[PDB]
Amino acid sequence: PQSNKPCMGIVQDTLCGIRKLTLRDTFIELDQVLNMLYWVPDWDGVIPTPAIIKPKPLWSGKQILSVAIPNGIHLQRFDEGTTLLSPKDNGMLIIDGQIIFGVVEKKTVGSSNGGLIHVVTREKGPQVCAKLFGNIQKVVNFWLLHNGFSTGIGDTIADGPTMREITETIAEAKKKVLDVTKEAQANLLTAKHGMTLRESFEDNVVRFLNEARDKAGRLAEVNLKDLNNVKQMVMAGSKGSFINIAQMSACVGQQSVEGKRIAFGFVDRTLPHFSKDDYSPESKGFVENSYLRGLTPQEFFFHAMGGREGLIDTAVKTAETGYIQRRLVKALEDIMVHYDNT
Amino acid sequence: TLSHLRRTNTPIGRDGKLAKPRQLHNTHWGLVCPAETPEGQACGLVKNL
Amino acid sequence: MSEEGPQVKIREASKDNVDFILSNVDLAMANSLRRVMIAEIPTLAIDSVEVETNTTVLADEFIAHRLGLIPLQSMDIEQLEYSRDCFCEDHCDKCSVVLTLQAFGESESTTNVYSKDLVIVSNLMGRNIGHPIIQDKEGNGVLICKLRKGQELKLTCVAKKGIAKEHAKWGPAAAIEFEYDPWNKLKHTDYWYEQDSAKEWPQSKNCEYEDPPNEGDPFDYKAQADTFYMNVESVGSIPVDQVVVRGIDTLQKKVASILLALTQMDQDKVN
Amino acid sequence: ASRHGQKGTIGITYRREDMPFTAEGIVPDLIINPHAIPSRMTVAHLIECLLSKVAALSGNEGDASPFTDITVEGISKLLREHGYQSRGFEVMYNGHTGKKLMAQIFFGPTYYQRLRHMVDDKIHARARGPMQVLTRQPVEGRSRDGG
Amino acid sequence: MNAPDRFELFLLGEGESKLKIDPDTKAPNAVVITFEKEDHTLGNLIRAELLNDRKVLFAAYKVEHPFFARFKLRIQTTEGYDPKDALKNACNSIINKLGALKTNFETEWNLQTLAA
Amino acid sequence: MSNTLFDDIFQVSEVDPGRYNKVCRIEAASTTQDQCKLTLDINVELFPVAAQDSLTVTIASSLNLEDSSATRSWRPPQAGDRSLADDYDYVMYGTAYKFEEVSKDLIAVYYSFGGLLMRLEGNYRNLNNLKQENAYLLIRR
Amino acid sequence: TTFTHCEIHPSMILGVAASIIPFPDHNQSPRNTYQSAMGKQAMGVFLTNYNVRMDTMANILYYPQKPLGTTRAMEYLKFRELPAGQNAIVAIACYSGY
Amino acid sequence: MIVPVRCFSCGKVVGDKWESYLNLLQEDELDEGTALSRLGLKRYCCRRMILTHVDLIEKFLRYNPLEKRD
């Protein structure tokens, strides 16, 4: 009742599996269908007629997974660019318990509004949804025990051409920053609206570097195939996002402290290895490497400060939030809905 | 034992809300370990050479 | 020759390793055979120790655990009895074996306590059992402990009969290799590639025993797994051919127990 | 715990028969979940696994010091000299039925440390027992069987 | 410590029946048979053999929790044919196959020893 | 009354593999009637199909060659049993979920064989009897 | 171009706790902090003469193994003389959901 | 701490081979990989057992359980 939406759902590896099961690619033979149908404790002893009767009987994952879903459940969801005959296998159509079309993933069996869990609870009851959790988990775990799944260092590697465009984008951003520096050093740069000249220079540099990192990350993400395990986990919705892929593969980016770049701790520099009055990005906390490539010492130091900030944040604001929470609950503890409805 | 015989304490109130003594500073390069620090109320206040 | 049954082709053999092909068989049967060969074949191992003198630098249960894994000859294990069935109190003469260990570090240089120094003092009744397994050139076998000047160890060991489903010490097989379908004709595994899957994955030694598929042939959607390539190595207690034969016998006895129980229940239903 | 901030607890134990195996009869001493890699970005865990595998297969100590010249591609080259798939994957069979597994599995040695917390030192229950002298409420302390 | 004894994996307790047969109330000619102190080694073999009988419709097994050694088998056959008879035929066929396998292996091993 | 509800001969233009590695989507035009087109998802690994091929497509309501299997459990095939499936070379079972009226003289029907989709576009009289809820699609190459 | 000194080696900007992580620069920094914390709760040979001492508590490991991947700095912390773990074969996978 | 008798992974026995393995390292002046393969250690788990062993028994042995200081 805090946000009127489900607080539980299919999570972690069952979620990673229920998606690999319902692709159009996945077909099941006879023996495994028999074992799977036995595993569902609410089975009624009827074997679904296959979808490919000849020249070999096969079952589609959607068909076996439809056994767990109760009867009388209807669901419609139209995603971007999906027609009544989905070519991308997007959206979801469930009619009287049968998956017509659509892959099932975090938007369907997760803790989201209007998903399968919410409609099942609002139509049948809490006990039926409680049964549904275990039915789905048993079926999908039994199948995933025989399919298999892993992850390795080969999923963070990108092909050479993608590396070439990555380096070229980084180079062009560096050139833009250098040109803005040259313009500002000749008193030609114009201060922005209600904002000092130094702030204008800093704003331009920060924006350029951030856009560079984002574009490189998107190139490296578009390169990846469909049989990549990290991409599969991200697509399913179970662990990670495109930021993680970008940092492990494309580039880490710009380390900050207190919302600004790495200030001058010494007098007119940031580290004894530089020269006085240096404003280049690599000297003010920019990491152009990746976790797969390796960090050089200075950007390692700047990354360490960036992490220290968040560590401190957690360690203290735990206590402050605790005090606020106690005061709030003590203030309101004696309020009750009466029989007058007041 | 090695880590214990190489420890320094900054005698400021460990509940004191001064953020600047906690954070890593540019002058710690090579004289203080940036990675190793406790967690909790002694974050940043306890240093290891 | 039995042409209606499973076929076998031994290619290699030795005291420890047997390397063969099993054809005209289901996959379930071969899997069950390997599971039984690893888990459910009895053997003889030390199951209790009592110590008199311990002036070493190690603990007592430390040396007990070291002793509990030493391999001993168990060829005629069919003539012993489970100690939970023998009517004797504690350990029998028909339901146990007994050894003694004594060592003393008289010399200045440290002295090693190997497993060649276990001496059997019970009565074997003419059975080939209880001998320690020795496989190194020097004959010393498993080294057990270490001694200095003025240190002594004295203890007595009781060895019994059991299986590997209750402790790893009774297992007679080290590791068994189980392969089939090296050309992926059946499409059972799906390969992971960067550029060309056919090159990144090396080739198994077994490819020479089948003919490569041709790109013009459509996917054969009627085949089943029929040929398996196995290799079995023994810890040393039992000969390896005996490991295979005893695995088959144990599987037979389990199925026969199922049959007997079913017949008994049918007779009960008759009543 | 491993040396990269990845710690956990034992949740179940299996015997060598139910363990998935490779074509060579090797069995994993332990199995971890891959849902722990992405959000933590512990690529050093994967690199340590790869390099330790290469060192075990080869027989020499493998350098892993920071800020050096070792790269991932170099150790992958040194790996393929021995006869394994370069990205550390391997073919593994199911332990129960003996079939092949559709997806390959990342496999190799690592270093683990046994931490100081055992479940035998945290388990506690109480139905009734001693009280306190002043407040007459159940005492504090697990070793003094308190509430 | 709460670790159960290992011998509970292969020794039946007193008052324990190795088989328990129960008619299934949903499909005609169907029985659920519980085996005790057994694991996949036997269930997989029996189900794979029961799948070869043309009069057997359904045959499936499961092991509900990996803590306990026991499993369930479910059989459904055609009209005028008893599932217990199907189980008996499967066991007989398995036993004959294993005997032939043992004889073949012994012949091959002796031939190798002659060639050794 | 014969079971076969619809019968025709089509010719395929192009195949659409997409991202999949087993399933393909094809579109085809009827060589007899000009206002009949077909879009179909098929399992190529069993029934490979190339461009510019002629295929006989039948929609039937039962495989028994002579006159309750909808609610009966599917039983494995027996030796000595003959049926309509013995003539063709690719048989699939599915259910229909949408009847669309494109115009006055054209209608489309959607079928879903276990997640494999098919759209059939044709004249009213040709697709008059396709109001069924479960159907067998048979294909002969 | 007017240099006055040089760094003897960058690795020395790290303490004694973090001189045991392998490839620390391929890691997010809080992970290095977390392992620097947890490196003080491993079980191992705290001294080679633990036999006599009557300490309030002591833990000892039966068989310790020196790691296969070692940093060069360990040769000064003597981590290949008194290790604190074992080399375990690990398979990263999904298997039965446990 | 004396060498483990058995391999933790494949059940094999490596305990007896430690003494002979130490011989090849200085009497024959061979490398570690060839010495490990000379004794039939072929799976890399057995190589792991032998290769990474810290032999602590030769330090306790110069010592007594009586009178350690601090």
**Helices marked H in A185-296:** 197-223, 229-236, 242-245
Q: Which domain covers residue H1, as residue numbers? A: 1-66
Q: Give the dihedral of Cα atoms A318, A323, A328, A331; nearest 10 deg.
A: 160
CATH number for the segment(s) C4-42+169-268: 3.30.1360.10
How far CA G29 is from CA of A311, B8, D65, G25, H28, in Å, comes to 10, 21, 16, 8, 46
CB-CB under 8 Å, B26 with A270? yes
- Is H10 annotated to bind a ligand? Reply is yes
* CA-based end-to-end distance of chain B: 14
* CATH number reported for the structural domain that contains residue H25 in this entry: 1.10.10.60
What is the tally of structural domains in chain H? Answer: 1
Question: Phi and psi (nearest 5°) for G38?
Answer: -75, -5
- What is the DSSP secondary-structure string of A298-313? HHHHHHHHHHHHHHHH
Give the method used: cryo-EM
CB-CB under 8 Å, C200 with D86? yes
CA distance A64 to A94: 14
Instruction: Pull the structure tokens for residue C47.
Output: 């199951």
CB C249 within 8 A of CB C35: no
CA distance H42 to C270: 59
Query: Count of CB atoms within 10 A of residue D6's CB?
Result: 19
For residue F38, give the 3-state DSSP assignment. strand
Enumerate the known binding-site residues of C for Zn(2+): 86, 88, 92, 95
**Sign of the CA dihedral running A149, D102, H9, G69:** negative
Query: Count of CB atoms within 10 A of residue C19's CB?
Result: 15
CB-CB under 8 Å, B35 with G14? yes
Instruction: Pull the structure tokens for residue D93.
Output: 């069979």
- Is H5 annotated to bind a ligand? Reply is no
- CB within 8 Å of E52: residues ≥ 6 apart: E93
The answer to whether residue C221 neighbours chain F at the CB level (below 8 Å) is yes
Whether there are 3 or more C-beta pairs closer than 8 Å between H and F is no
Resolution (Å units): 3.3
Nearest CA in chain C to D89: C192
Query: Count of CB atoms within 10 A of residue A111's CB?
Result: 15
The answer to whether residue B24 neighbours chain G at the CB level (below 8 Å) is no
Phi-psi region of C32 (alpha: psi -120 to 50; beta: other; left: phi over 0): alpha
CB D16 within 8 A of CB C38: yes
CB A288 within 8 A of CB A256: no
Sketch the domain layout of chain E as residue ranges: 1-115
CA distance A112 to A91: 15
Q: Which of A26, A2, A22 is nearest to A14 (CA)?
A: A22
- Selected from 3.80.30.20, 3.30.70.1900, 2.170.120.12, 2.40.110.10, the CATH number assigned to the domain covering C43-168 reads 2.170.120.12
CB-CB under 8 Å, E30 with A45? yes
CA distance B36 to C169: 44
Query: What class is the F1-141 domain?
Result: mainly beta
Distance of CA A148 to the CA centre of its chain: 22
Contacts of H63 in chain C (CB under 8 A): 57
In total, chain C counts a number of residues equal to 271
CB-CB under 8 Å, A292 with G92? no
Contacts of D62 in chain G (CB under 8 A): 68-70
In terms of Cβ atoms closer than 10 Å to its own Cβ (0-12, 13-18, 19+), residue D123 is exposed
Q: Which of A110, C142, D110, E34 is nearest to H48 (CA)?
A: D110
In terms of Cβ atoms closer than 10 Å to its own Cβ (0-12, 13-18, 19+), residue C37 is buried
Residue F12 DSSP class? E
Query: Count of CB atoms within 10 A of residue C50's CB?
Result: 11
Q: Which of A301, A292, A330, A14 is nearest to A149 (CA)?
A: A14
- What is the DSSP secondary-structure string of C113-181? EESTT-EE-S--TT-S--PBP--SSSS--SEEEEE-TT-EEEEEEEEEEE-TTT-GGG--EEEEEEE--
Fold of E1-115: Gyrase A; domain 2 (3.30.1360)
- Is H7 annotated to bind a ligand? Reply is yes
- What is the DSSP secondary-structure string of C36-94? HHHHS--EEEEEEEEEEEE-SSS-HHHHHHHHTT--B--TTGGGS--TTTSSSSSS-SS
Residue B26 DSSP class? G
- CB within 8 Å of C215: residues ≥ 6 apart: none
Contacts of A34 in chain E (CB under 8 A): 58-60
Contacts of G15 in chain B (CB under 8 A): 3, 6, 33, 35-36, 48-49
CA distance C103 to C113: 7
- CB within 8 Å of A2: residues ≥ 6 apart: none
CA distance G73 to G10: 12
For residue A330, give the 3-state DSSP assignment. helix
In total, chain H counts a number of residues equal to 70
- What is the DSSP secondary-structure string of D12-76? ----TTTS-EETT----SEEE-GGGSTTTT-HHHHHHHHHHHHHHHHTSPEE--SSSS--HHHHH
CA distance A307 to A311: 6
Phi-psi region of E25 (alpha: psi -120 to 50; beta: other; left: phi over 0): alpha
For residue B27, give the 3-state DSSP assignment. helix
Instruction: Tell me the nearest-neighbour CA distance from E75 into chain F, angstroms.
Output: 14
In total, chain G counts a number of residues equal to 98
Sketch the domain layout of chain C as residue ranges: 4-42+169-268, 43-168
Instruction: Pull the structure tokens for residue A74.
Output: 């209807």
CB A287 within 8 A of CB A297: no
- CB within 8 Å of C188: residues ≥ 6 apart: C181, D99, D100, D102
User: Which chains share 3+ C-beta pairs under 8 angstroms with D?
Assistant: A, C, E, G, H
If interface means Cβ-Cβ distance under 8 Å, which residues of chain A face chain F? 22-25, 27, 30, 45-60, 62-63, 84-87, 93, 95, 98-101, 226
CB F37 within 8 A of CB F121: yes
CB-CB under 8 Å, G11 with D66? yes
Nearest CA in chain A to E52: A31
Q: In whole angstroms, how large is the CA radius of gyration of chain E?
A: 18
Q: Which of C190, C219, C220, C222 to mutate to test the interface with F (most CBs of F within 10 A)?
A: C219
CB F8 within 8 A of CB F30: yes
